[PDB]
Amino acid sequence: SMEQVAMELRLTELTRLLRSVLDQLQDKDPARIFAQPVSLKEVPDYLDHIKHPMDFATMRKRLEAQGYKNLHEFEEDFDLIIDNCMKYNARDTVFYRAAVRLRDQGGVVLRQARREVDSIG
Ligand code: NA
């Protein structure tokens, strides 16, 4: 149908907007601490601590498969990256501190993406 196509045109434009948002969030992590999944060979106990691992590359594969239906689902994954890190790592570590900085600097990008998604549908 012509309906399914226009919904596919919208999802595709949402995917284009989330791609740009994702590139902007990732620029706030120049150390690439959150780039890749936490290694299970190097942190074998990780899954005893953290039940839903997340990282930028895993968000990227979901993105290019048009796996995010809305901005909220995308925000949930970003929050997991941050919240996982702040639980596993203690306050006086480079990892925890990197999360806090990504959270505060990401807020601005997420604040405007919410207005743009509403605004253009
Ligand atoms: Na902790």
Numbering used by the authors: 22 to 142
Paper excerpt:
In this work, we show that unencumbered views of the changed, non-ground state can be obtained by recasting the problem as a multi-data set, 3D background-correction problem, which allows the relevant signal to be extracted from conventional single-data set density. Our new method—Pan-Dataset Density Analysis (PanDDA)—comprises: the characterization of a set of related crystallographic data sets of the same crystal form; the identification of (binding) events; and the subtraction of ground state density to reveal clear density for events. We demonstrate the power of the method by applying it to the most demanding type of changed-state study, namely crystallographic fragment screening, which attempts to observe in electron density the rare and often low occupancy binding events that occur when a relatively large (200–1,000) library of weak-binding ‘fragment' compounds (150–300 Da, 100 μM–10 mM)1819 are added individually or as cocktails to a series of equivalent crystals. Applied to a series of fragment screens, PanDDA yielded markedly more hits than manual inspection of density, far more quickly and all with high confidence, in both known binding sites and new allosteric sites.
An accurate estimate of the background can be obtained by averaging near-convergence density, in real space and after local alignment, from dozens (>30) of independently measured but approximately identical ground-state crystals. Using an averaged ground-state map for subtraction, as opposed to a single ground-state map, reduces experimental noise in the ground-state estimate and thereby also in the event map. Finally, the averaging generates an estimate of the ground state that can be used directly as density, bypassing the need for any subjective modelling and map interpretation. Conventionally, the analysis is challenging as it involves inspecting a lot of 3D space—the whole unit cell in each data set—for convincing evidence of bound fragments (‘hits'). In contrast, PanDDA directly eliminates the thousands of strong electron density blobs with no statistical significance, objectively identifying only regions that are unique to each data set; the ground-state data sets are provided by the many hit-free crystals. All crystallographic data used for the PanDDA analysis must also be made available so that the analysis may be reproduced. The group deposition feature recently added by the PDB22 makes it realistic to deposit all the many changed- and ground-state structures, as well as event maps (see Data Availability).
